[PDB]
Structure formats: C-alpha cells, structure tokens
C-alpha cells in the first residue's frame, strides 16, 4: 500500500478542510461588517483560493475580528500542501535514485566481497597444496 | 538530455495547459456576470498570470460559479511549475554531485583494487617460502 498517497493525497484532503473552513467561518463572520461582500458562502468561495496559494485578488475579503484569525489558518495550509507535493515528487524521483543506490552498492559490494573471496580461495588452494607437500611425502 | 527535459520541459508544457484552460474557460464563463471584464480573452490574459504565481492584482477576475473551479486549476499549476524548476536545477547540481561521486569511487576503488590484490601477491609469496623451506631443507 502506498504510504506516499496516504501522506500526500491525505494532507491535500486535509488542505480542503482549510478551504472549507475559510469560505465558511470568515464568510459567516463577514455578513454584516462595514464593507462585507464576503457575506455569502457560494460567492465567498473565491476567498480561501487566493489565500492558500496567496494569490490575493481582492474581490472577496473580511474586515472583522474573528474573520481574520479564521483566515491566517487558510494561508498556512496552502504552504503546508506545497511542501507535501514536493515530498511526493522526491518520493518517486528518489525511488528511482533508490533503484540507483541499491543496484550500485549491491553490485560493487557483492563484487568486491567475492574479490576478497577469491583471494581466500587463493589460500585454500595453497594450504591444501602445502599439505600435499607434507605428510604425503614423508609417508 | 535524459528524463529531466522530459520531466521538466514536459510539465512546464502541461503548465501551459493550465494557462490556456485558465483564460479560456473562466473568461467565457465571465462574458455576462455582474462585473465582467474577464469577458474578452485578449484582455483577460492578465488573469491567469496573477493566478499561477499567485500575484493577484485584481483588474481581471471572475464572480461566476464555473469560472472559479476553472481558476483554482490555474494557481495549482503555478506551484507545480515551481517544484519542477526545483527538480530541473537539483538535477544539474546533483548531476555534478554524482560526478564528484564518480571521482570519489574511482579513487576509493583503485586504492582498494591495486594496493589490495597486492596482498595476495605476498600471500603466495610466503607460501612459496615454506614450500621451499620444506623441500629445500629436506629433499
């Protein structure tokens, strides 16, 4: 099971909870403030879109007190979702770089180890050789 | 020229499909909304520029329903191309980190190869010594 899609496609769905808590709690607290067009929810939906990605147009925004603290929470998730998307393109770009690391070190190591090995056999062949010169020559 | 330009110059061209589906669909759905100058395409082009990079000026933007969902798609590609120009450069400088890695391994290897097998040279060396202590001293 991917734990990259339960990390990226799981904090991008938690990102929508900051896009649905931005045109929902700062649009309700914007239905009667001096200069409130962020009144309706369906119309103040273009609000938490220019907040997250911090595009910031201006056709939708608050002027209240508790409509601003429920706004700064929206631009925080926008950045929280950008570092996450970054973490899933470095999960599969480095999983390729991971195919690299495993193929390289497993090749050089198993290869070198056996190079040590051969050296050892150099020994065996030699010990056995000497043995033959040994006991089998005196008796 | 590997899957770098087919990764970078392939998602920056998929970026243009969010710049051409952003002054094209949210500019058509903006030709009769209360406060529509995002009507004309040639004039509503400064729209998907302030969306992607999330500059967000305000002289061009929608108030419709299906002119907003075809807008959030534009600022998404703006960041996607930022994580991309991020992968193109890390490709360059780590392509030099994998080059210094080439020098590193060849110096670590050639020093583990010739000064190592040199031991086997002597392994036999001392073996030929007893092969000779025995039948140089006995027969």
């Amino acid at each position, epitope marked *: 099971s991917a734990l990259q899609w339960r990390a990226a496609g799981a904090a991008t769905v938690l990102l929508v909870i900051v896009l649905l808590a931005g045109s929902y709690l700062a649009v309700l607290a914007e239905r009667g403030a001096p200069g409130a067009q962020l009144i309706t929810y369906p119309r103040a939906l273009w609000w938490s879109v220019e907040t997250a990605t911090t595009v910031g147009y201006g056709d939708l925004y608050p002027v209240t007190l508790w409509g601003r603290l429920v706004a700064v929470v929206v631009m925080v998730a926008g950045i929280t979702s950008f570092g996450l998307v970054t973490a899933a393109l470095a999960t599969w770009f480095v999983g390729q770089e991971q195919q690299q690391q495993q193929q390289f070190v497993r090749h050089s190591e198993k290869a070198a180890e056996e190079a040590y090995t051969r050296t050892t*056999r150099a020994l065996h062949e030699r010990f*056995d050789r000497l043995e033959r*010169m040994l006991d089998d*020559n005196r008796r | 020229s590997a899957l770098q330009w087919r990764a970078a110059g392939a998602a920056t061209v998929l970026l243009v499909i969010v710049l051409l589906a952003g002054s094209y669909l949210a500019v058509l759905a903006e030709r009769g909304a209360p406060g529509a100058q995002l009507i004309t395409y040639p004039r509503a082009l400064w729209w998907s520029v302030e969306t992607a990079t999330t500059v967000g000026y305000g002289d061009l933007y929608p108030v419709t329903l299906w002119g907003r969902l075809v807008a959030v798609v534009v600022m998404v590609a703006g960041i996607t191309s930022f994580g991309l120009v991020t992968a193109a450069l890390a490709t360059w400088f780590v392509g030099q980190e994998q080059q210094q890695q080439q020098q590193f391994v060849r110096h670590s290897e050639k020093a583990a190869e010739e000064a190592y097998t040199r031991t086997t040279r002597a392994l036999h060396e001392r073996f030929d010594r007893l*092969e000779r202590m025995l*039948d140089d001293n006995r*027969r």
Partner: antibody, heavy 124, light 110 residues
Framework: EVQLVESGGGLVQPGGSLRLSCAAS????????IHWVRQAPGKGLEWVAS????????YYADSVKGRFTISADTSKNTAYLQMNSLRAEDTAVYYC?????????????????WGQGTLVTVSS | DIQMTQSPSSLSASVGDRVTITCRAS??????VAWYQQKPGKAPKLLIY???FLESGVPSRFSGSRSGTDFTLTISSLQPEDFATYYC???????????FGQGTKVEIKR
C-alpha cells in the same frame, strides 16, 4: 566409467579463433582439474593451459599468453580451451587430461586419464 | 618455472634387455615427476606417478628412481610390446604441474 572427450579441433587460417571442449564423463570436474596438452604434429608432448575448477584457478603455459583462455562450466560438465590469435605453430593434437586436485593423496597421481584429442590445423 | 631434460632422445636395444632412462630437472621437484609411455597414434599412458610408485595397472618391469633432482625410469626384462616413446613429466611447480621432457623413443634393434 570414466573417460574424456576433446571436440572442436578443426581448420583455421592463421590468427583465427577456435574453441575446444573437453567433455568429461566419469567424475564431476567440480572437484578435479583439467589440463590441455597439445602434441605438435610429429614433434613432442607440450602442455598448454589447465584449470582447477575447484579452487577458482587457471594456469597457462609461457608459450601462450594473451591468446588462450581455459575456462570451465560445471553446470554442464566440460572444460574449454579457447584459442584466439592462432599462429601457424599452434597446429597439433590437442588432448586434455585430469589430475586430482590438491586434496587427499590423489594429487600425487598427476595426469591419470587423457582423452584422444582433436586436431587443430592452423594454416592459410 | 621448472625445466626438464630427458635422456636420451632415443635408443636401441633388443627384447629381454634392461633399459634405463634418466631425466634431470632444473630445480627442486621433490617427487612430482611422472612417466608416460606413448604408442604412436594413441594418447600417453601413465606409468609412474610419485616418481616412486607405479599406476594401478602397469607391468611390474617398470621401475622409478630418484636422486633429488635426477629421476630414472627403468625397464628390467624389456618385452616385445614396450616399443614406444617415453615422456618424463613433473607436477611440482606452481606454473601448473605439467612439464614434460624431450621424450625418449625406444625402438628395437634386430
């Protein structure tokens, strides 16, 4: 019932290539060593290269160096002497024989059983 | 890299005779010298292996000797079918174990 089988000798213009195969048949070459000994045509006995497939070793004669390559596959059961830059003097009767490796006392018998040999004719 | 000098090239003698072939080495072999009798046409046959003992199927008339460096094959009571070429080989060296000498060819004198 042991015996050896050289195969592959033939006719090759000088500086050509050839592969002889010493098909073994009574023992596992796994624990034995295969020699390749070529007698010239009408001249005396000469050793070329040998291989102890048990230790991971090989040995070639000073008569041939960058040209021959004795090697062996144990999955099948054969040794192969590989000839590459065949000179006009490489023409001969190529035999192959065994000797036990360095193991018990058997190594002291040396070229215990030979095969009949194949003829290699190097000439333009 | 050990060398070998057999002796002599060839020889003449009648059957029932006593033939002795020497070989002399260029270095210390201990007892890794072997004797082979080859009958024109077929491959060599093994005669003596430790330069001391003989193969498990050889005429008892074949004897091996050693003087540290000099080895000598000897055939007491030479028969009528011992007419072949004889090769003295050694298997002590660490080149490989093979090295044969210029062989001796025993033809008969009638």
């Amino acid at each position: 019932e042991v015996q050896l089988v050289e195969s592959g000798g033939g006719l090759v213009q000088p500086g050509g290539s050839l592969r002889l195969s010493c098909a073994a048949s009574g023992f596992n070459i796994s624990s034995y060593s295969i020699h390749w000994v070529r007698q010239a045509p009408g001249k005396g006995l000469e050793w070329v290269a040998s291989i102890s497939s048990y230790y991971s070793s090989t040995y070639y004669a000073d008569s041939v160096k960058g040209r021959f390559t004795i090697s062996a596959d144990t999955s099948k059961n054969t040794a192969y002497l590989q000839m590459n830059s065949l000179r006009a003097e490489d023409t001969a009767v190529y035999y192959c024989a065994r000797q036990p490796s360095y193991h018990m006392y058997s190594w002291w018998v040396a070229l215990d059983y030979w095969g009949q040999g194949t003829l290699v004719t190097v000439s333009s | 890299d050990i060398q070998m000098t057999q002796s002599p090239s060839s020889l003449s003698a009648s059957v029932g005779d006593r033939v002795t072939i020497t070989c002399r080495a260029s270095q210390d072999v201990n007892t890794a010298v072997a004797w082979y009798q080859q009958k024109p046409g077929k491959a060599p046959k093994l005669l003596i292996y430790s330069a001391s003992f003989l193969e498990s199927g050889v005429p008892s008339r074949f004897s091996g000797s050693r003087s540290g460096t000099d080895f000598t094959l000897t055939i007491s009571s030479l028969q009528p079918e011992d007419f072949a070429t004889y090769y003295c080989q050694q298997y002590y060296s660490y080149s490989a174990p093979v090295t044969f000498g210029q062989g001796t060819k025993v033809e008969i004198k009638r």
